[PDB]
Design a protein around this ligand. Structure first.
Ligand SMILES: Nc1ncnc2c1ncn2[C@@H]1O[C@H](COP(=O)(O)OP(=O)(O)OP(=O)(O)O)[C@@H](O)[C@H]1O
Ligand SMILES: Nc1ncnc2c1ncn2[C@@H]1O[C@H](COP(=O)(O)OP(=O)(O)OP(=O)(O)O)[C@@H](O)[C@H]1O
Ligand SMILES: Nc1ncnc2c1ncn2[C@@H]1O[C@H](COP(=O)(O)OP(=O)(O)OP(=O)(O)O)[C@@H](O)[C@H]1O
Ligand SMILES: Nc1ncnc2c1ncn2[C@@H]1O[C@H](COP(=O)(O)OP(=O)(O)OP(=O)(O)O)[C@@H](O)[C@H]1O
Ligand SMILES: Nc1ncnc2c1ncn2[C@@H]1O[C@H](COP(=O)(O)OP(=O)(O)OP(=O)(O)O)[C@@H](O)[C@H]1O
Ligand SMILES: Nc1ncnc2c1ncn2[C@@H]1O[C@H](COP(=O)(O)OP(=O)(O)OP(=O)(O)O)[C@@H](O)[C@H]1O
Ligand SMILES: Nc1ncnc2c1ncn2[C@@H]1O[C@H](COP(=O)(O)OP(=O)(O)OP(=O)(O)O)[C@@H](O)[C@H]1O
Ligand SMILES: Nc1ncnc2c1ncn2[C@@H]1O[C@H](COP(=O)(O)OP(=O)(O)OP(=O)(O)O)[C@@H](O)[C@H]1O
Lengths: 135, 139, 139, 135, 135, 139, 135, 139
């Protein structure tokens, strides 16, 4: 039921807007206040927080969500520390955006339930979308 | 026969080439970098080394003959817009382009791109969709 | 009344503004840089500070009302193409743009520029013409 | 009668092509061989030379021309040394492309007969071209 | 008994030379051949390998060692993937050089037995060395 | 009283300051950056903001009065060598310096550094020692 | 009798201090106010001015000096425009610091009475100073 | 015989080599750049290509045998200080060095340079002297 998105970049921010459009409630979070404001109107709650800090993770209630998506970008360290922590809180489903090959490999062994690769995944989508031309 | 062609064998471009191959489709794969072209020899019917911004090289490829041509050039807005510009000249039925940002999208719309892809954002909506399906479709 | 507008008050843009003033024509002068706008206050009917790439700022200027609009933005192909892109949307009767190179020229042709200026090259032909006149016209 | 162009950049190169199209003979010169080749077909003679070197200027015969245009670009020093030398050879008309304000001022006091400013000059041309709309 | 050092930088390379001087046998490994050669004379065996690749880790016999030190530097991703893999092979003691705060935190939760911080640790050493002045 | 002074509150410098405090020793902590000086106010008897390369600022600090002065300046070989150069002038009984590389070490030896620290390498030998102790001392 | 120094860099500034030490009066000038202040105590008069501007050159009285040294540095254009102007005012002796080979060549043809090359000239000085070891 | 050696054949270094030759003195000219070494073959008894910062290369040159050695390395304070550091080790009777700035001067004083040259400033005093002579000596 619950949906929480950590990291409001193009990928993460986009999934927050879609959840909203599809009439779903979503907790949006990011360390950058500016980022949090840009999506405040699309989320039930938009909170400024460093997903690395366990104390901020608890005062956030993140442990109460069924699905938490980690969409941190360039900061690969924050990304794996964050999923490591969500895994300690036993979040049912934690999906993570993988920055690169090594990142996927660490995430796989860390406890991420689904690893997302925008570029590659969108690529197979377009290939299947190309075939559909004659379906 | 000569239905699909992909220019730019990066993560995105190369991925559409592999998937097409897996689905048993013929695919023309091109890049300016030879190391990229050699990495996709086992997936493309033909994998040629060429500069998509060169009008002559586009003829030596036969591109004017494909129904769909994907411009998957990355961090080079210039090479990307130039290329789709040359493709529209050869009146390609369908030219799809990976956009880098809002600026790039704006020029591609007017320059001839029939479809514009924004991997990050677009994948975001599909992830939202998968999440909704987990609960709504009761999956 | 509202016949000419020049966006980009560099050497080229500012020069067309001054000459127009000298010829007694009304001219709308714009730049994003205030120091540039203040340097042309004595030559333009109105000298406004604005970012030509912003759709809102283009309305707050009234640009949709001019017959000729010159995009004289320099070393910023992006700001330049974006701007002429917004101008064509507002259906400007005549939009003239200073091109930076071959690539820039190619996008401007398809994006809406009615005339494209290449200062260096273009001035070269006129200099050739002046040389021919020195001898041919016996001057 | 004679026309010689020193510096085959966009400005200089362009005036060589126009002279040719208008059926005129022109001596084209530049220090960069590649540049000289790009315009070899448009000039009666295209020669590789450093216009700074007096010896190369004489083995070039530059002193025999009525009009010599100095179209050196960024190398402002070469530009003023070159016009200084052409002035010593008493060339009838020496026209020079001015790089900036100080450059114009030195050229003016050095002996350049006409100082050309592409950007500014093309600017008044466009202003006059704009008026002509109702002429 | 067994000692294996992954990453032959200043830190890792230095521990290999000391083990040798103290008459100990040590397996030295690095992805850069040049690095491996610089320490070939100090180790019983010096092998070129990407510690990220499980296949290279096995053809290396790394699983047979009692102590394996991961001294990768700037490549923080390789560093945590490498310790993650050594942990899967159940190496008795795996000591890791921590690049920064987040890195220590991930390493701590990953299975590193000892986390080393050259700068900080050498710092307390000097403080204790300063006191000893009057001991 | 005025026994230890540490210039440069980076990872290395700040660490010696904290440990000294933990051991109950008085310590003079200095840095040019105020944010660094404020981060160590709870560990140093006195935490002053100063540029160790300035002869005047070194007098306003009283440095000539300490038995041991640690130059823990990092990625600034110049600020580092200059500083130890000024310290040797004031005839400091003991001046210890963190070296950045072989070049830096070579100049520090001749410029007056009584002891030169190479964190990475030096820590490497101690780690080797700990490993030997695990087996040799049967620990 | 009169001495004026234009450009208070290491070279120009140094000649102002020496003239002062040797009990001579000197007019010091530079476009940068900070520069002018750094030598205000060594000159009879220290004035802020752009030596390129003829109006500033006259309100300066520069034309009344017997020796004017142009010590502009990187701004080679200002340097040659400035000597060109001092030459129009017919200054008896104008000495100029040459930035490079082309610069010397233009200066030579412009009217500079003496061209100074710190690096090269100091070089022959040291060679002669080396010989003197056995003189 | 083996009286003078100059390391660094830039404007300054090369100039001392030429003048020495003109005065009929033997001179050992060295540089790391071959194009610089070839430009001074007609002025030096011996013009060798070597890296003055390498202890071995300094022995293969015989430098320990010269009374005067000039370090005329330019925009490389490191190569400059390192070199004079190695020269002082070989106990050179006289080592003269071109300084780049105040910082460089300060390290050279303590590292072994017997004389330090600051071209710009130093030439400034000589120019002042020439000016005084024009009037004072009534020249
Ligand atoms: N420790 C953290 N806790 C919470 N949010 C974080 C943390 N670290 C980074 N973020 C946020 O995650 C987001 C990272 O997405 P990112 O900025 O890398 O995408 P982008 O660069 O904006 O564009 P793209 O998606 O194409 O890479 C940023 O908005 C950033 O503020
Ligand atoms: N002018 C060109 N003609 C043909 N191919 C080109 C041209 N310019 C670039 N390419 C190729 O297109 C690809 C661009 O993708 P990119 O440079 O962003 O690498 P990538 O990051 O792995 O791809 P992606 O951004 O999808 O992850 C490269 O393989 C590059 O060699
Ligand atoms: N987005 C923009 N909107 C409006 N004006 C702009 C914008 N971007 C740049 N300009 C202005 O346009 C002018 C660009 O000309 P440029 O930057 O090349 O200086 P310039 O070299 O003197 O002009 P020129 O190239 O003709 O000699 C500048 O005055 C700049 O401030
Ligand atoms: N000393 C010289 N003698 C002869 N030719 C020279 C000399 N110095 C420079 N040139 C030539 O003059 C030309 C300078 O024009 P330039 O290259 O600056 O224009 P550009 O940079 O190509 O484009 P633009 O005209 O817009 O500045 C060059 O082709 C250069 O090789
Ligand atoms: N995946 C890997 N497998 C094996 N070795 C690796 C791997 N990745 C990096 N290394 C090696 O680990 C070492 C990293 O240490 P590093 O180079 O960062 O220290 P340094 O930069 O040389 O100096 P410092 O210790 O002060 O940082 C390198 O020699 C590198 O080749
Ligand atoms: N001239 C100076 N005088 C006094 N302090 C200085 C001076 N220059 C730099 N410092 C300080 O010395 C410290 C240098 O350490 P550094 O810049 O390498 O940061 P760091 O990496 O955290 O330290 P370390 O290299 O030990 O990890 C900084 O806190 C810096 O502000
Ligand atoms: N047009 C001008 N009129 C008056 N003074 C000028 C003018 N242009 C430059 N200057 C001054 O001339 C001086 C140039 O000397 P310069 O700064 O190049 O030497 P430096 O860079 O400080 O060190 P060095 O002498 O080794 O090059 C500067 O102080 C500058 O402010
Ligand atoms: N490590 C070295 N050993 C020997 N020679 C060196 C070394 N490093 C640099 N050099 C040489 O010393 C000279 C340095 O002078 P520089 O780089 O400043 O050129 P320059 O500007 O013409 O000399 P100057 O500053 O006197 O005008 C160069 O010829 C360079 O090749």
């Amino acid at each position: 039921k619950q949906f929480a998105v950590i990291g409001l970049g193009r990928f993460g921010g986009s999934i927050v807007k879609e959840l909203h459009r599809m009439g779903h409630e979503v907790l949006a979070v990011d360390i950058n206040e500016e980022k949090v404001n840009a999506y405040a109107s699309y989320a039930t709650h938009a909170v400024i927080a460093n997903a690395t800090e366990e104390n901020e993770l608890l005062s956030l209630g993140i442990r109460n969500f069924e699905y938490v998506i980690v969409a941190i970008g360039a900061n690969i360290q924050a990304s794996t520390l964050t999923t490591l922590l969500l895994k300690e809180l036993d979040i049912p489903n934690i999906w993570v955006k993988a920055q690169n090959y090594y990142h996927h490999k660490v995430l796989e062994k860390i406890g991420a339930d689904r690893i997302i690769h925008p570029e590659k995944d969108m690529g197979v989508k377009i290939a299947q979308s190309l075939s559909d031309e004659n379906v």
